Amino acid sequence: ADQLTEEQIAEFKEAFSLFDKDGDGTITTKELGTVMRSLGQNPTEAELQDMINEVDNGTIDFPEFLTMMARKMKDTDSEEEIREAFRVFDKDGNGYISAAELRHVMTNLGEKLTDEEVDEMIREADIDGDGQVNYEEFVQMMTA
């Protein structure tokens, strides 16, 4: 649905090559950070190291960089949709999701499950054992 425009890709290319010391087209972890800070963000040591190893020495070219930027777009869109869904699942707006609320919303979404199956999903996502699923437990449940 949501994809990178030609304008964004061109800007990513200019930010990539602006901090590429050689003409190889492959930047390091340290150079990747400067690129990120030029794009209005501020990742840390581990974050930069996790990003560079997710798209494969510790160096990446632009096609791999664009892949990483696309995944960021995919993740940030999923993050808000999960945030959107939580407000929908939380029918009374108390900040928690009961088994009754889960079963009701699932019905409207063409998902007819037994009362036992609903209890299982709640039991599976309930970490602190309050009986209901809050936002933190909901994110882990949706991310998987």
């Binding site: 649905a1 999923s78 949709e81 999960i82 869904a85 019905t107 409207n108 979404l109 063409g110 998902e111 449940m141 949706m142 998987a144």
Partner: peptide, 17 residues
């Protein structure tokens, strides 16, 4: 009539068992 969710929606990915 149930709601129609986009294929790239996390909720539909929750439908997957």
């Amino acid at each position: 009539a149930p709601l129609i969710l986009p294929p790239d929606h996390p909720v539909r990915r929750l439908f997957q068992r």
